Amino acid sequence: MFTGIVQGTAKLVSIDEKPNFRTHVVELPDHMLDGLETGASVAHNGCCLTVTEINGNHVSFDLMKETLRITNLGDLKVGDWVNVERAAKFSDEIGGH
């Protein structure tokens, strides 16, 4: 199975470039501002990465430069928005339905 369907979108507003790692920050909309936190895994259109820090409604994520070229993450540009979805490192997974 697979849906690639996103809970909501994010607005690229700032790029943070560190010679050790690349960092990108987006602006979380009203329905993604709630629940998300640092260390969370956000998938941008389906590419999972973790929150390095939250700048209020904004969230910076970490991104390896070679991973950026290897992935299609490098394509991101500020002023654009991203399909963002919340991912969890671990879950109880009782079952439910």
Ligand X SMILES: Cc1cc2nc3c(=O)[nH]c(=O)nc-3n(C[C@H](O)[C@H](O)[C@H](O)CO)c2cc1C
Q: Nearest-CA neighbor of 45 among 14, 8, 79, 15?
A: 8
Q: Does 40 bind a second copy (CB under 8 A)?
A: no
- Partner whose footprint covers residue 32, from ligand X, a second copy, none (CB < 5 to 8 Å by kind): none
Any binding-site annotation on 76?
no
Beta partners for residue 86, in sequence order: 42
Residues that bind ligand X (CB under 6 A): 3, 5, 41, 48-50, 61-64, 67, 70-71, 73
- Binding site feature residues: 4-6, 48-50, 62-67
- Binding site feature residues for 2,4-dihydroxypteridine: 4-6, 48-50, 62-67
